[PDB]
Amino acid sequence: SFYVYCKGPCQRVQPGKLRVQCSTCRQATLTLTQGPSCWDDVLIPNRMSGECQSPHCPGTSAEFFFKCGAHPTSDKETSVALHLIATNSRNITCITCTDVRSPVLVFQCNSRHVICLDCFHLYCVTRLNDRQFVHDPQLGYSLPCVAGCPNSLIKELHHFRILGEEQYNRYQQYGAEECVLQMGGVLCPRPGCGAGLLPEPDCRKVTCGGNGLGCGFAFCRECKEAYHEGECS
Amino acid sequence: MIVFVRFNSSHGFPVEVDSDTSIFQLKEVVAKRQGVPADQLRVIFAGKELRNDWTVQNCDLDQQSIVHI
Amino acid sequence: MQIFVKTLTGKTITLEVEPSDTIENVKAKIQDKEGIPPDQQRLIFAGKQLEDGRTLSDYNIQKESTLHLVLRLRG
Ligand SMILES: [Zn+2]
Ligand SMILES: [Zn+2]
Ligand SMILES: [Zn+2]
Ligand SMILES: [Zn+2]
Ligand SMILES: [Zn+2]
Ligand SMILES: [Zn+2]
């Protein structure tokens, strides 16, 4: 079975359904020439093909979508696929707690390590609050295998939906902050602000209020106090 | 059980069926509602055309899923 | 569909978008609402900078999800 995050009404990880529409008219009228064999076939856009059987449309490209399977859903009531999550049919023990639960998340390390969702939730809630998530300019704010295996950063960041709503929003906040900093940017030091700013690297003067997006504070990026001439302190 | 039909992208309408109900039976009942021939109708579900001889059970149609007739 | 754009201050803007709207397209609508020139805008989702050429669907951004906005300063 496949698993998705249903944002409503389930607000949880649920078994999902795979469906397909024509990429041009966005209607489930396309008949596939062949069935999908791998995740890439359904995840990478325009990868598979067929004929949209609505006459006025010369539909060629197939667009796969996923729905929650726990209740009836409309055609456009889509959920994000959590492709790392799998039914634990073979009763593989969790790499962390050693217990058997279903479903489980499978890391894309060489050892394909398996973690239960309780422990994954735990791994995530622990690393975020300790600022131990990793920034990759290619992937974003992610976590590797809990075992610390190389090249194991989670690519689909919707997996962090297991954090729950509030912690998920915090995750996204923290990730955006980290993105700014890794790009050589600054967060405004004024209390109640904290706007993400990306000045030229040469500039010491950073001004935060033109369109209402800023607080107008002009500060020195080094000492983070009001802009001054010469050396700090 | 109920199956929703989108006739030529029209707003889905419910149709009551059984496990034993065939595709042509559904084609007929829809043809009557739309007053058209059942022979001009094609049923599309999960990127596949459903053949007349297939039943609802055989097609693994879940409660209140949608076909594109 | 409805998505949200938030600054790191928590200031929130609501946009009406399609999954097919490019990141460039999302950046525009923001100018229409708040008057921020698109060139000054950088959009981020889950800590990943969004590239103009790409669509919301490329990042699997769902209805009612949030993008983060930060500003480039020329000085
Ligand atoms: Zn659901
Ligand atoms: Zn089409
Ligand atoms: Zn565990
Ligand atoms: Zn591993
Ligand atoms: Zn500020
Ligand atoms: Zn200074």
Q: Which two tokens stand for residue A99?
A: 């217990």
Strand partners, A49: A61
Residues of B in contact with A56 (CB under 8 A): none
Identify the three-state secondary structure at position C13. strand
C with A: touching (≥3 Cβ pairs within 8 Å): yes
Considering the domain delimited by B2-67, tell me its CATH architecture: Roll (3.10)
Residues of A in contact with B66 (CB under 8 A): 28, 74-75
Kindly report the backbone phi and psi dihedral angles of residue A36, in degrees, each rounded to the nearest multiple of 5, phi listed first.
-70, 140
Name the residue among A133, A171, A176 with its Cβ closest to that of C8: A176
- Taking only Cα atoms into account, the Rg of chain B, rounded to an integer number of angstroms, comes to 11
Nearest listed ligand to the Cα of residue A146: 4
Q: Which CATH number characterizes residue C20's domain?
A: 3.10.20.90
> How many contacts, defined by CB atoms under 8 Å, are there between A and B?
42
Which domain, by its residues, includes C2? 1-75
**If you measure from the C-alpha of residue A206 to the centroid of ligand 6, how many angstroms do you get, rounded to a whole number?**
11
Ligand 1 is an ion; residues with CB less than 5 A from it: A 6, 10, 14, 68, 70
CA distance C22 to C73: 23
Name the residue among A19, A29, A54 with its Cβ closest to that of B46: A19
Experimental approach taken: X-ray
Continuous segment of H or E residues that includes residue C24:
helix C23-34
CB count, 10 Å around CB of B44?
A: 22
CA distance A137 to A179: 8
Measured between CA atoms, the residue of chain A closest to residue C54 is A45
Instruction: Tell me, letter by letter, the H, E, C secondary structure of C37-60.
Output: CHHHEEEEECCEECCCCCEHHHHC
Domain ranges within chain B, ordered by starting residue: 2-67
Domain count, chain C: 1
